[PDB]
A paper describes a structure:
Structure 1 was determined using a Δhelix-His construct that lacked the N-terminal helix but included a C-terminal His-tag. The Δhelix-His structure represented an inactive state due to covalent modification of Cys276 by cacodylate, which was present in the crystallization solution. Cacodylate modification of Cys276, which lies below the nucleophilic Asp of the DxDxT motif, induced a major rearrangement of active site loops and residues, including an Asn residue (N268) that binds Mg2+, the adjacent Arg residue (R269) we implicate in PA recognition below, and an Asp residue (D272) that is mutated to His or Asn in rhabdomyolysis, which formed a hydrogen bond with a Mg2+ bound water in other active states of catalysis. In sharp contrast, in the Δhelix-His structure (Structure 1), cap region 2 formed an upward facing alpha helix that was continuous with the prior helix and would be perpendicular to the membrane interface. This unique conformation was formed through crystal contacts, with the continuous alpha helix packing into the active site of an adjacent molecule. We thus consider this conformation of cap region 2 to be an artifact of crystallization and represent a catalytically incompetent state. However, it does highlight the flexibility of cap region 2, which may be important for the regulation of lipin/Pah PAP activity.
Author numbering: 20 to 153, 168 to 268, 273 to 331
Write the structure that this text describes.
Amino acid sequence: MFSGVVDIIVVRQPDDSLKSMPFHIRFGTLKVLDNQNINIQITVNDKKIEDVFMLMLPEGACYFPELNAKNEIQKKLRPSSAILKKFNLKNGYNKIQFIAESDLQGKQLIEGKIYLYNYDTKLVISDVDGTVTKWTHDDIAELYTNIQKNGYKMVYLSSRPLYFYNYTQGYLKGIIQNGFTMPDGPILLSPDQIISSLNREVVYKKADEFKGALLKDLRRVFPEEVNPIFAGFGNATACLYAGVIIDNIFIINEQSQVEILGKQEKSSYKKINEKIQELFPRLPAAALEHHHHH
């Protein structure tokens, strides 16, 4: 029944090509009389994108048809670099709209967020439930704000059912703590919550493995030479194996006590923020860009 777009992440590669994570979109309130007559068009930052379209399976999952060498059509959740370049994305947040039309009248519109990162961007992962929520932990909005001000990008992770996705986005946007708000960033969704025929290879993972796979997939959109995930906040093997050093894995408990793994330091969001230059050292070029957009 979901209508919407799971936030999309696109990364520019050192050779100028673009790669993205999967496009997960649904038109849950559209009655589809015949899926083969559906075509989906794309508008980015209020500009229609020419010569790009998506198709829809009988089950409602949407994909990019792309010819392989055999002139066979492959059904792709991840569009080609050539297609992504037609979007004319800017660094950071971009508005994206998908419009499902048929041979008949009536067009279904959904709106999402698509983020563009350069390959040298440094990401800071945060769980939502239990890490942002306890009710919201104290001092988290000031810390995350100052992480973002030092040039890092907050990336949120959720494993709630798709039903709650737009609510989780509203929750994060509504936090305010002493004037501080949560930095805008993408919310990635555990893949077991958005299974279709297009990503069903997923189903041969055990339930415990989905976060780790998600973080490896996030890393894979970056080039082999870089290490993009700088730190992670949770409530650990998943961060470690996706390239987070153990000192940068922050695990909060019941009591709002934060354990800095591998230092076995017991700390807080307030105290991490006090030592922000030591733990999240300023990234000069990346910080300048954030400052001059905000």
